[PDB]
Structure formats: C-alpha cells, structure tokens
Design a protein around this ligand. Sequence first.
Ligand code: CLA
Ligand code: CLA
Ligand code: CLA
Ligand code: CLA
Ligand code: CLA
Ligand code: CLA
Ligand code: CLA
Ligand SMILES: CC1=C(/C=C/C(C)=C/C=C/C(C)=C/C=C/C=C(C)/C=C/C=C(C)/C=C/C2=C(C)CCCC2(C)C)C(C)(C)CCC1
Ligand code: SF4
Lengths: 34, 31, 80, 64, 75, 161, 733, 41, 142
Amino acid sequence: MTASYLPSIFVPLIGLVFPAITMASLFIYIEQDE
Amino acid sequence: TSISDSQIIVALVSAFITGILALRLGKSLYQ
Amino acid sequence: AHSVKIYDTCIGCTQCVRACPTDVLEMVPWDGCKASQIASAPRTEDCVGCKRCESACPTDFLSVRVYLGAETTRSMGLAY
Amino acid sequence: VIGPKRGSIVKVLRRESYWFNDTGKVVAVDQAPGVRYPVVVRFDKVNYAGVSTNNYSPDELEQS
Amino acid sequence: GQLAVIFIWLSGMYFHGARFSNYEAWLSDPTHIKPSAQVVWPIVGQKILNGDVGGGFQGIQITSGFFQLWRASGI
Amino acid sequence: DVAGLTPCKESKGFAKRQKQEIKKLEGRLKLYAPDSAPALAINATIEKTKRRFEFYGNQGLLCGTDGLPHLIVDGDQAHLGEFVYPGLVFLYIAGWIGWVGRAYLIDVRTSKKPTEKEIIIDVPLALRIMSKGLTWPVAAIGELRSGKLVEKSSNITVSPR
Amino acid sequence: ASRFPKFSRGLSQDPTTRRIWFGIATAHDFESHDDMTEERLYQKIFASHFGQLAIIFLWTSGNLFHVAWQGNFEAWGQDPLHVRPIAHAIWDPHFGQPAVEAFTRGGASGPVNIAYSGVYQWWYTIGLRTNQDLYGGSIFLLFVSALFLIAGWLHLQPKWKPSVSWFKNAESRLNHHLSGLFGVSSLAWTGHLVHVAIPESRGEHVRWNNLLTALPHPQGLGPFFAGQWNVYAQNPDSNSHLFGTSEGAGTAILTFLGGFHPQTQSLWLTDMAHHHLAIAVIFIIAGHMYRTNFGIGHSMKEILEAHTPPGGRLGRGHKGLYDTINNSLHFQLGLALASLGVITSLVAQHMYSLPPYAFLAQDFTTQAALYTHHQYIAGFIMTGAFAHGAIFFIRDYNPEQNKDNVLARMLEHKEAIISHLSWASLFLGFHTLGLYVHNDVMLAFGTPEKQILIEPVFAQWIQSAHGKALYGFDVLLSSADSPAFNAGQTLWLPGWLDAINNNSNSLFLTIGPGDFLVHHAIALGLHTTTLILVKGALDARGSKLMPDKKEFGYSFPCDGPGRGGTCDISAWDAFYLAVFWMLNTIGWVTFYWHWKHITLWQGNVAQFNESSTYLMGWLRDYLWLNSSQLINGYNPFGMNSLSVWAWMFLFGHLVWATGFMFLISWRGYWQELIETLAWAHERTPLANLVRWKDKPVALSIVQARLVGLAHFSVGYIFTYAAFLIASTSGKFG
Amino acid sequence: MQDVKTYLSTAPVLATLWFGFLAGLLIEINRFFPDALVLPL
Amino acid sequence: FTPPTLNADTPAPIFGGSTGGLLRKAQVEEFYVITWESPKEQIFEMPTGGAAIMRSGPNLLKLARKEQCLALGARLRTKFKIQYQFYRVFPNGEVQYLHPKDGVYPEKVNAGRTAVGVNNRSIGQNANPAELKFAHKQAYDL
Ligand code: CLA
Ligand code: CLA
Ligand code: CLA
Ligand code: CLA
Ligand code: CLA
Ligand code: CLA
Ligand code: CLA
Ligand SMILES: CC1=C(/C=C/C(C)=C/C=C/C(C)=C/C=C/C=C(C)/C=C/C=C(C)/C=C/C2=C(C)CCCC2(C)C)C(C)(C)CCC1
Ligand code: SF4
C-alpha cells in the first residue's frame, strides 16, 4: 500500500462523520413544516 | 509497479470533481 | 381522507349506515329503488377505512365502495 | 310490463356479477316508473358474501 | 368421555407391556436391556425398526418410563 | 447399453450389495438363538432379500456404476414393464376414479338437495356409479364425440376482463 | 405544506412516520407524482439513466483502483495457479491481533480480502498486466462517469431537453442500438482483442505508445482487402503455448479452433475475437432494418398489423400492439427485464461450462460465486419483469385500442392458462416429492436397490448428439457416418470433441437419476413461480372476488374482511408471494450446481451419484458435511480467516428470522403496543419534555410485507453466500 | 337404522372405511407380492 | 333544526380514573364531548376500558376519538334506550355539533338531506385507468 495512513484517515470519516452529517441533514430536512 | 502519491491525489481530485457533478445532477433531478 | 362512493345499485337497506363506526354515511331521499332512499357520504373526512359498510352491503357487488388514501389524523384512528 | 315474466329462467349479462353466465329464477319485477334495477333474481348458489339473490335491469338479463 | 379415552390409552399401554414387551427380561437385567413395548409388522422393510433391544427381544425402544414405573409399583 | 448401463445379472456392484446386505443380516442374526422368534424373523428377512435380488436380476434391470437398478422411460420395448405398462395401469385406475366421481356429481346435480348428497354420499347410487367405471375410456370418448363432455364457454362464469 | 415527499401532497400532510417511509419508498414512481407530465417523466427517466450509468462506471473504476492500490495483480499474473487474488485492504479498528494475522493473505503486509469476482482473470485475459494499467483504466472510467453526469445534467436543461416524440422514435433507436451500440461496440472489442489482448497473451506488449507501430498480423490488412481471409488463420497457437509467453505462440489472429486452451482451460482468444467480429457484422447488418429518414426500411407498426392469421385463431393478431407498446413504458420495462433475465441465466450457464478467462476454471470459489451471483440476479430480474407486466395491465392497458388482439385473447382465456399452470405444478411437485420420499424411505429401511432411479435418457441422448461418447448412442457427432460429424470435423470438432470427452471440466457433465430428480424439481420451481406471477399479472385488473381491482392500483393492502376475507388480493401481493418461490428455485439450482461441482472438483463424483437421489443425502453429504469448516471459523480455541464467513452465516440466519417476524405478525398487535408506548412516554417525567413531531404508528400492511420480504431475501443471500464461499475456499475442492 | 345408515354414509366415516379397505388391500398385496420395481409381463 | 349548544354545567359520570383518556392530542389538536340524558343511576362500560355510573339526568363525557363516541352512543341507544349527541371541541374553544346534523339519526331517511358521493351508474361501469393517464383524477371521481 502506497499510503498506509490513508485508510486510517478515510475509514473513520465515511464510517462515523459522513453518516452523522448525512443523518443530521436528512432529519432536519424531513422534519421541516414549510 | 505500485502507484504513487501523486496518482492517489489525482484520483482523489477526479473523484471530488465527479462528486461535484453528481451533486449538480441531483439538484437538477430535484426540481 | 378516504373516498367513499355510492352507486345506483343501492336498494336503501340502510345496513351500511348502521355498520359505520364514525358516522360517515347517511340515508337521503331517492327515487331509483323500492325503498325510496339511497346512501350518501357527506362527511368522508371522518372515515377511517374499515370497510364495515362494504361488508354490510347485500348487493352482488358493492353499491358502497371505499377507496382509501390520504391517511390523515382522523383516518389513522390516533388518540395521541 | 317491464322485464321478464315471474318465475322465468334468466341468464345474467352483468360482467361484475358473481353470477355472470349463470341461470336464475325471476321472483318479482317492479313496474314503478323510475326504478333502475327492478328485476329480482334468485340463484341456486350463493356468492362470497353469502347472498343468493340480486336485482338487475331487464337489459342485462336474457331468456335462457 | 375424556376420562374414558384416557382409560383406553392406559389400558393399551399396559396391554402392550403385557404382550409386546420385554418387561420381564428387563427386570432380570435392567442396566443392559433397553425397554421396548412396541413391535412392528414385517411388511415394507419397516421390520428393520425392530431393533436389538436386548433380552431376546426385537422392537421399538420405548422412552415413556413405564418400565421403571411398574418396577416401582412392584409389578 | 441404453446409456452405458450393464444388466444387473452380470453387475458386480449388484452382487456386492447382495453380499453386504446378507452379511449384515447374518451379523444381526449371530446374537440370537437359532430357535428364537427374532432368529426366524431375521431368516425371513434373508429369504426376502434373496428373492428380491433374484427377481430384480431375472427381469433384465439395468444397473449403473455400482449396483442400483435404473429405469428407462423412453419407450424402449425391452423396458416397457417399468413405466409404460404400469403407467397405463395407473391411467386406467385414475381415469376410473375421476370418471365415476364426475358421474356421481352429474347424477346428484339433478337432486333436490345436492349439497346433502355430497356431504352424505348416496351409497347405493355411488356404488352403481362406481360399477360403471370398468369401461370408462369408451364412455369418455363417447361423451367427447357427442359433445356432452365439455361445457360450452357461454355457460361458464368468468371474471371481468 | 411541502414537506419531505414534495412529489405527493397526501404524504406530506400525513402527521405520522408513515410519511417518511412512503416518501422514501415511492420516490422513483415518477408516474405517481403530483403534477406529472409525460414530457417531464421521460426527461427525468433519461437523466436517471445517465445517473445509473455514472454509478456503474464509478463502481467498476473503484474496483480497478482498489485492485491496483491494495492488490497483488502483478504477483498473481506471474503465478496465477498459486497466488490468491486480493480484493482490497481491511482497516477494521475492532480487530484483534489474531484477526489481523488471520486475514493477512496473498502476500500482503496487512489484513486483506481475497477476491472471488474473477476480475483478476478477466483483466489478465484482456491484456492488463501491471498496476499502472489498472490505474489508468480507473482514471479513464472516472472521466467517463463524469462525462455521463455532465450529459445527464445537460439534457435536463431547457435548450437541450428532448421531446416526447423523440423518446417514442422506436425505429431510429433500434437502428442505432443494433448497429452502433451492439455491432460497433463488438467491432471495437474484437479490434482490442486483435491489437492488445492476443499480442499480450503471445508475449508482445502493445500499448497506446505503439498501437500504430505494433503490427497485429505480419500481413496487415492485405489479405483482408484481397478477400483471402484464410491468411488470418494459417498459424494457430500450439497446445504447448503458455499464456502470456512467446513459447508455443502462433501468428493467427482469427482462428476457429473451438474447445479450450490446454494450459488455461479456457476459450482461445482468437476464437473470441472471431466471435465478436462475426456478431458485429451480423448486428451492424441487422441495424439497417427499420425506416428512419431515408425512405428505406420497415414500419414496425405495419409489420405488426400485417401479421394476423387469416383463419382468425389469433383474432385480430398484432393489430394495435405498436401503440400499446410504444405508449406504455411498463411494457417496455417488462420485455427488457424478461430478455435480461433470460440472458443472465444464459451467462451463468455458459461461463461455468465454457470459461472465457484464463485460469478461471482452476479458481473454483470464483466460478461458484459467479454462477450463484448471476443466477440470483436473473431470478430477481424475472420477478421484476412479471411485476411490471402486472403494472402494465393495471395502469397502461386500454381494452379499447387492444380489441381482440393477442393481449385481449390472453386476458380472455386466462383461466385456462392459470389452471394448466396449476396442473403442471401439482403434477411435478407430487411426483418429484413422492419419488424423493420413496428413495428416502428405501435408504432408511436399508434397501437402496428398491429406489425409483429414472435415467435422464433424453438429456443423455442430447449429450450424445453433442459428441459425448460415454452413453454410446452414436448419433449426431457421436457417429462417424453422420453428415453433421463430417461437416464439422474440419473446423471445430477436433477441439469440441476433445473438450466434451474430457470429464475433468464442466463441459456437459455426466448426469444420472439424481440429475433427473433435481431438474424436475427445477421445472417445478419455474412452473410454480410462473404460475404465481402470471396469475398476478392476469388477475391484476380484476377477478370474481374483486372485479374492480384496477381502480385500487397495483399495491394495496386488501379489500377488508368482507366477502370471506381479501388478504393478498393485489398483484403486488402476487409478486410478494412469487419472490419466495423464486428464492427457493434459485436455491435449488445453486445447491445442485454447488454439490455437483464439489464432488467433481474433489474427484469423488460417486458421492453425488449415490446420495443425490434421496433428500437425507442432500442434508447430510452436502449441507451438514460442507458446513464443518464454516462453523469452525471462530471457536473457543481460536479463529481463522473463515471467521468472517461464519459470522455472516449467523448474520444471515438472524436476518432471515427477523423477516419471519415481519411476515407472521401482521399489524394490529404493534399498533396497540405503540399506543401503549406513546402513553408511557407522555407520562414519564424528564422524558415528556422531549416530544416527537411525527406520531409513531405501526408499519402498514404492504410495508410490513415488503420489509419482511427484504429481511428474508437478505438473510437468504448472505447465508448462502457465506456457506458457498466458506465451503469452497476452506477446502480448495 | 335409517339415521345410523345416514351417519355411516357421511363423508368422514365413508372416507375412513374406504381408505382403510384400500390400505388393507395394498398391505396384503405387498405381503404376497413385495419389493417389485418392474411390472412382470 | 337548530343545533344545541354545549352546556358547561353538565355533571360527568362517576368514574374512578383510567389510563385510557385524554392525551396531548386533546390539548393540541382536538377532542370530543358526548352528552346524554339518563332517567336513573346505572352502570355502563366506558369505551376506553372500565365501568362508570351515569348521572340520573344530564351527563357529559370527554373522549379522544369520534369512534369512541359512536361506540358509547350505540351501546346507550341499543341497551339503555337513551338519546345522545356529541360535539367536536378544539383547543381554541370552538365547538362543532356532529352526530345528528339535522336532529334525525342517519339510519332514518330525512328530507332536506343532499346526496353526496352518489354515482348514477353501476360500479362495473367505471372508466379504465389507461384512458385517464396523466390526468389528475380518478375513475370513481367521474
Ligand atoms: C390408588 C391407590 C392404588 C393404586 C393406584 C394401586 C395400583 C395397583 N395395585 Mg395396589 N393397593 C392399594 C392401592 C392402590 N393400588 C391398597 C390400598 C392396597 C391394600 C393395602 C393395595 C394392595 C395391592 C395388592 C396386594 C396388589 C396390588 C396390585 C396393584 C396393581 C393393579 C393390578 C391389578 O390387578 O389391577 C386390576 C385389579 C382391580 C381390582 C381393578 C380393576 C377393577 C375390577 C374389574 C373391579 C371393578 C369393580 C369395582 C367395584 C368398580 C369400582 C368403580 C367405582 C364404583 C369406584 C397396580 C400397580 C397388584 C399388583 O400387580 O402388585 C404389583 C397386587 O398384587 N395392590
Ligand atoms: C463505488 C466504488 C467504490 C467502493 C465501494 C469503495 C469502497 C471502499 N473504499 Mg474506495 N475508492 C473508489 C471507489 C470505491 N471504493 C474510488 C473511485 C477512489 C478514488 C478516489 C477510491 C479511493 C479510496 C481510498 C483512498 C480509500 C478508499 C477506501 C475504501 C474503503 C472504505 C470506505 C472509504 O473510506 O471510502 C473512501 C472512498 C473515496 C474517497 C472515493 C470516493 C467515493 C467513490 C467515488 C464512490 C462514491 C459513489 C458510489 C456510487 C456510492 C453511491 C452511494 C450509494 C447510492 C451506494 C471501502 C472498501 C479506504 C480503504 O482502503 O480502507 C481500507 C481508503 O483509504 N477508497
Ligand atoms: C397429554 C397429556 C399427557 C400425557 C400423554 C402424559 C404422559 C405421561 N406422563 Mg404426564 N402429566 C400431564 C400430562 C400428560 N402426561 C399433566 C398435565 C400433568 C400434571 C398433573 C402430568 C404429570 C405427570 C407426573 C407427575 C408423572 C407423569 C407421568 C407420565 C407417563 C405416564 C406413566 C403413567 O401411567 O403414570 C401415571 C402417573 C403416575 C402413576 C404418577 C402421577 C402422580 C400425580 C402427582 C398424581 C396426579 C394428581 C392429580 C390427579 C392431578 C391434578 C392435580 C391438581 C388438582 C392440583 C407418560 C410419559 C409419570 C412418569 O413420567 O412416569 C415415568 C409421572 O410420574 N405425568
Ligand atoms: C447487479 C448487477 C450486476 C453486477 C453487480 C454484476 C457483477 C459482475 N458481473 Mg455480471 N451481469 C449482469 C449483472 C450484474 N453483474 C447482467 C444483468 C448481465 C447480463 C447482460 C451480466 C453479464 C455478465 C457477463 C457476461 C460477465 C459479467 C461479469 C461480472 C463481474 C465483473 C464486473 C463487471 O461486470 O464489470 C463491470 C464492467 C463495466 C461496468 C464496463 C462494461 C462496459 C463495456 C465494456 C462497454 C463496451 C462498449 C464500448 C464502450 C464501446 C466502444 C466505443 C467505440 C470505441 C466504438 C462481476 C462479478 C464478468 C465476469 O464474471 O468476469 C469474471 C463477465 O464476463 N456479467
Ligand atoms: C430496469 C430495472 C427497473 C426499473 C427501471 C424499475 C422501475 C420501477 N419499478 Mg420495478 N422492479 C425491478 C426493476 C426495475 N424497476 C425488478 C428487478 C423487480 C423485482 C425485484 C422490480 C419490482 C417492482 C415492484 C414490485 C414494484 C416496482 C415499482 C417500480 C417503480 C417505482 C420504484 C420505486 O418506488 O423505487 C423506490 C425504491 C424502493 C422502494 C426500493 C427500496 C430498497 C429495496 C426494498 C431493497 C433493499 C434491500 C436491502 C435493505 C438493502 C441491502 C442491505 C444490505 C445490508 C444487504 C419504477 C417505475 C413499483 C411500481 O411501479 O409501483 C406501482 C412496484 O410496486 N418494481
Ligand atoms: C415445503 C414447503 C412447501 C410445500 C410442500 C408447498 C407445496 C405447494 N405450494 Mg406452497 N409455499 C411455501 C412452501 C411450500 N409449498 C412457502 C414457504 C411459500 C411462500 C409464502 C409458498 C407459496 C405458495 C404459493 C404462492 C403457491 C404455492 C403453491 C404450492 C403447490 C405447488 C404444486 C405442488 O408442489 O404440488 C404438489 C403438492 C405438494 C408438494 C403438497 C404436499 C402434498 C402432501 C405431501 C401429500 C399429502 C400427504 C398426506 C396424505 C397428508 C397427511 C395429513 C393428514 C391427512 C394425516 C403445493 C401445494 C402454488 C399452488 O397451490 O398452485 C397449485 C401457489 O400458487 N405455495
Ligand atoms: C408418486 C410417487 C411414488 C411412486 C411412483 C411409487 C411407486 C412404488 N413404490 Mg413407493 N412410496 C412413495 C411414493 C411413490 N411410490 C411414498 C411417498 C412413500 C412413503 C410412504 C413410499 C413408500 C414405499 C415403500 C415403503 C414401498 C414402496 C413401493 C413401491 C412400488 C410398488 C408399491 C405397490 O403396492 O406395488 C404393488 C402393486 C400393486 C398394488 C398393483 C396395483 C393393484 C390395483 C388394485 C390394480 C389391480 C389391477 C387392475 C384393476 C387391472 C389393471 C390391468 C392389468 C392388465 C394389470 C412402486 C415402485 C414398494 C416396493 O416394492 O418398492 C419397490 C415398497 O416396499 N413405496
Ligand atoms: C406478463 C407480461 C409481460 C411479461 C412477460 C414475461 C416476463 C414473459 C417471459 C417470457 C420468456 C422468458 C420466454 C422465453 C422463451 C424462450 C424460448 C421461446 C426459447 C426458444 C428456444 C429455441 C427456439 C431454441 C432453438 C435451438 C435450440 C433448442 C438449441 C440449439 C440451437 C437452436 C437455435 C436450434 C409483459 C411485460 C411482456 C407484458 C404483459 C404480459
Ligand atoms: S349501500 Fe348497500 S348497505 Fe348501504 S343502503 Fe345501499 S344497499 Fe344498503
């Protein structure tokens, strides 16, 4: 592997942060009254 | 032979651009 | 809410009105049958969709038809 | 008269009827001007709801 | 009626213990003879089910505990 | 030979299976006294197995790799006794049953209370209907040609299209 | 008030969590959205197709990138038969040290996954050799996906939006797709094979920097334009050829040998090149059939009207079918999915027996995974085709224009169709189950000679007609005096007969009574699934129980407990019930394939030939026997690389049972329970301060069925995939 | 006896009698003609 | 027929309390109020679960759903032979008379009632969905 640190970086993001942002945004969106 | 970090970052930039285009197409499908 | 329709095949037996648990149907004057009355649904917004009115209709196929849809608060039968 | 004679054997032409292409006996026909389905037909076999009789207009009943 | 049915069932168990069983052989040696009180007929190869339970007997090995109950009762 | 199958008479696997089954039965037999009833049962088993294998060999059954009779159902004249002959017997029996049942239904649709006749079968009527199934194919062909076998589509209930 | 389901006013006004579920689940039903116009519908479908193409190309580019970055593609190529392919690296923070060292395979420096998709063999066959080639391919496919995204955005713009009439131009679309999409693409692929793949397999290195310099044949394009094409087949590769090495290589680029490469046990590259060239010619010719703009061609509508038997047995024939098919997207979708499912089954059935990729036959787990994959995909596609046929009948079928044509005649005698399907299913099921139970009882009683073992002589006769000499029928390429044998002995038979008379491969495997019984089980499964699906499609518009089913739509729960009860009376419920049967049928198919190939690969085919005739053999010698290494993936004494497959095995079992939960208990229990829980939350201190906005409700009936079906299917797929991979890779045999 | 004969003519009693007779016939046939896979003719 | 007004001085039945009653919906969206006249003190069964004694005279009972009002009213009519009427009450103090809209129960035909939802054709004479494609209307709405 050319960059061994790069998995250790990316896996946490797409695993925890991306779901957090995605679900927070979708929860804010589906609970709008407009 | 094994790919280099320059190739890795080129792939990452290409994926970022494809993501921009995907978001654009999603916004075009939305409305 | 749900859409309830009455057809000219109705015989004015009133059995669909008595089976309704939310008082959606009522009998109105009519001249197309011996009973001189026909069912009607003036307040379908209270209909829950049980189709008990459908089970009580004696015609070959139903003179009263419930089509469901919308599923509003009164439709879902929620007390909370 | 309006439709078939009393007691006659009639065949049903209503597509939505449980007794389409089936034979029944006429019980009564109402002569009141305004009734849309005056002919009363009795059937030998019940439908899914358990009813063995129905009302038809003369134009959807044929003589055997 | 249920009591009559249960009586018939128990009478059947005791009959099958009397005739189609190796109860006495099991009494002579209870630690090495398998209890059996059901014997199949030799019709379609089902006779293989008459296994060697011991005591010079072949039959279905029963697991109802009737042998031990009759041993306790003094039969 | 009809898909590389040897006849079971000269099939070594068939004889091996014979020997193995007989040896297993004799091993089960060794633990019983000769005069005992279990011994008689096991000896009857041995005789039954021997006659079964002799019968299978005598009818020219086809054994594959190892000993297992295989059935040919392509219509070969040398194997008509496996599927065609018993198949025809089955067709005669099944058609008997169905034909007599149909006849009974016909004969009870003219009754005043047919449903009671279906839940409570008219045993004399049913029996004299059943007696008529001996020549069922002839009656079936006669009804087919006369037109009394198949109901016209104009008198059969159908759902809307 | 314009909430999350902006395409549905009714869902937006739902104050329950049903709004969220149905907005998620009804997003892609464009025809059902409010204020939907056919023009907007077609343009939205076009842009969604662009998006799907972009997603597919991203998926393949990611596969390429991961194999290039974390794989052993070069090491595998240097030594294919003793190197395990690597899919991608693993970075699981939850692993322990034993898990770290258990998953370090393929000569990696850390935990990796071993690929079972065949991408290594496929890319080695088509000429890719180094990681830089794969990286370039991945970058190129990223660019292609970006281009498709740009196109999808572009055709949605006001000045580049196509019109409805453009979307309904059937003749031009067929001409272009047959000529260019099918024919020219195959021509380009055979050009690749001639220029890159074949020279790579013969030791030459042809890339973009020497494409115009490298000469595919010593006599380049001379004999092509002179009509003496035989020059391109004069010197085929010898049987001592080593793939990728100049030793034993030839100079022919379009051969016709047939059979398999002796060293790779795969089809010759030159044979595939000639294949693609021939089908490209045929497709390019076929794409000139219809009339577009030049006064020559065909009118498909007029073809359909012309094809009516004069005797009236078919009624009006195919009159009005052109408009019915061109106006209904669901008819087109159903036809496309039917053809695609058939072709996917064909792909699965032809790649295991005729492996096109080098060193793919030796990779047993890859072959098994590929077969199971494409068979399950085909089954799902077939269910979709039938579901969309039902949707066509409900939503797009007009009896006025389709009057007495073939569709109306199918609707007229649908009772006969359904009754005959019922009879076929009943006969097959009764007799196959009875024979199996007979064999079970005979083995149970110790008398295996009393089994009813029916020899599949029809399929064996066909095998003999294909050149199989094992059964001794001696006809149609099994006999020397047959005219077919004499015609073919010069071109392919030297290779085909050698390949089919080799019993070490999967080309026309030997079959017996077990093969007879299992094929009849397969016929039962196909017939019963088709019965359910056709019954749903033809009773979709109505029935005696519900004559007005068309007004209620495709997926509705029921019609209430009146008239005896009307559960699962919709066509969507027919699809729901047919998904179970298709899962069962593909399970039988894959079980047979897998067991047959385990006993073939291990060399002991007698186990299958003796145990497949009774179901206890299936349970013990296949399921119980082959799961021993699977269930030992992790145990109190340690763990190994099969621990992940054991965990997935148990996971699939759990999801299967949760699907059972959603399928058995139906709705009311949960609605009352949720009422109680709402009371409890509203009465609890420190928690009644937190309030929901969407009133919690139990899942709806249709939603419950779909969720249970999804759980059932996911458990099915994961359990069988784990078992398949673990039992085919724990023992490479 | 009319009522007893009517009861004995009911579907379950007649089914029991007929199927028991059929089972006895098949069992006796297998007693005298057992373990046959081929109809000899 | 002049609809009656909802009196706020009507005593409620003797009930000991229950977990099935008014909830947050009653105070944010709506609830219902049923009134009936009884000749004597008798025990009836609450539609929400339990038993209560109705007053010897006017009664006033708060419900969360219209279906519970109909259930209690039907039991009162077919068991105690008691006339009843209920109202829909909103959080802002709006009261709507509901069940006898014209003073006569819906089972009995009454003049002055308009036919709503009545279709002048047979149920099987509906238009096909295909003919109504891309039109925002249903077959039964014609
Ligand atoms: C509830 C208590 C109870 C139970 C369950 C048993 C059960 C048994 N006893 Mg024990 N026994 C009991 C009390 C009990 N006994 C008492 C209190 C005594 C006196 C101390 C004895 C003394 C005794 C002896 C000495 C023997 C038994 C035996 C037996 C066995 C029955 C064998 C036999 O011939 O039965 C069938 C015989 C019967 C008399 C019962 C059948 C009914 C017949 C036909 C008469 C019916 C007429 C009758 C008046 C109807 C009454 C019905 C209703 C009006 C009440 C059995 C294990 C015998 C055995 O096998 O030893 C192991 C044996 O030898 N028992
Ligand atoms: C769909 C294709 C695909 C898939 C399934 C994966 C899967 C994975 N990648 Mg890879 N990757 C891909 C394409 C893909 N990759 C491409 C095109 C690039 C070039 C930029 C990379 C570059 C890359 C790096 C550098 C790393 C991974 C890593 C990983 C792993 C952890 C997830 C992660 O961090 O993602 C990160 C992924 C990216 C940054 C690429 C962007 C996302 C791509 C373009 C796909 C997005 C669209 C796709 C259709 C999904 C749609 C969502 C949904 C509808 C299905 C996982 C095995 C990590 C790893 O190896 O851990 C062991 C890691 O460090 N990926
Ligand atoms: C379908 C119903 C069914 C069936 C087929 C069986 C079958 C069997 N039971 Mg079980 N059993 C059942 C229901 C059933 N049981 C129920 C509901 C109870 C609870 C009352 C029991 C309690 C029970 C006990 C305690 C024993 C059995 C035993 C047996 C075996 C019978 C041996 C025998 O004849 O001894 C008949 C039983 C005895 C001689 C001893 C019974 C002693 C009890 C305390 C007397 C019953 C008192 C009273 C009548 C019950 C009601 C009490 C209530 C009013 C408080 C056999 C395996 C016996 C066994 O396993 O032997 C190996 C055994 O010891 N059963
Ligand atoms: C859910 C859908 C799905 C998935 C995930 C897979 C997954 C897989 N399939 Mg399967 N397949 C499916 C559906 C699916 N398949 C269906 C429906 C069919 C029937 C058509 C097939 C037919 C099929 C075949 C025949 C083969 C596979 C193979 C494969 C494997 C390789 C990955 C792949 O396809 O490369 C993804 C590749 C792409 C997305 C690129 C495809 C684009 C081509 C090259 C276009 C060529 C045109 C060109 C641009 C024209 C040139 C223009 C100009 C110069 C003239 C993988 C296990 C292969 C395999 O098992 O190899 C080991 C294999 O040989 N599949
Ligand atoms: C070319 C392929 C294709 C296309 C374009 C369509 C397009 C369409 N279909 Mg069809 N369909 C297809 C293939 C296709 N389908 C196949 C293969 C099947 C068989 C399975 C079906 C079965 C089918 C049915 C039964 C129905 C449709 C419907 C529809 C329409 C709405 C779909 C929707 O709401 O999406 C939204 C998407 C979803 C709700 C899918 C959600 C995700 C599912 C449940 C799978 C999730 C599995 C799992 C949880 C994820 C993996 C987890 C992991 C841990 C393993 C739309 C016109 C519906 C329609 O027309 O309504 C009238 C309808 O009722 N389709
Ligand atoms: C092992 C489980 C199992 C079995 C045996 C069946 C069997 C059957 N299903 Mg069912 N089904 C199942 C699971 C099963 N299904 C599941 C899980 C689903 C998903 C929900 C379905 C969904 C489903 C649908 C949607 C349809 C079927 C249909 C069928 C029939 C197909 C034709 C056939 O095989 O005829 C042969 C018959 C059998 C194999 C049934 C068993 C026959 C027994 C063994 C003979 C009797 C033995 C004995 C005398 C009885 C003793 C009892 C008592 C008297 C002592 C058949 C009745 C189709 C149908 O009815 O079409 C006609 C149909 O439309 N099934
Ligand atoms: C549909 C599936 C199927 C089929 C085809 C068979 C077929 C067979 N089984 Mg199997 N079996 C099955 C299911 C099936 N079984 C199941 C589900 C089970 C589990 C319960 C078994 C358990 C089983 C056992 C345990 C045994 C068999 C046996 C047999 C054989 C003979 C049985 C018999 O009575 O023949 C004897 C022949 C007859 C009864 C002839 C019919 C007589 C009638 C009355 C006609 C009378 C003549 C007629 C009126 C005139 C006709 C014209 C004339 C010229 C002949 C036969 C090969 C037996 C055997 O021999 O194995 C090889 C055996 O031991 N089977
Ligand atoms: C419901 C419906 C639908 C769907 C359907 C489906 C899904 C179907 C399917 C179907 C199918 C799925 C079919 C298949 C078929 C097949 C066939 C028909 C085959 C044929 C074959 C042949 C003909 C062959 C020949 C040959 C051989 C044998 C081999 C050798 C060579 C040759 C070629 C000679 C739609 C939407 C349309 C519409 C409505 C209706
Ligand atoms: S709709 Fe049916 S139940 Fe209601 S009054 Fe008319 S006929 Fe009677």
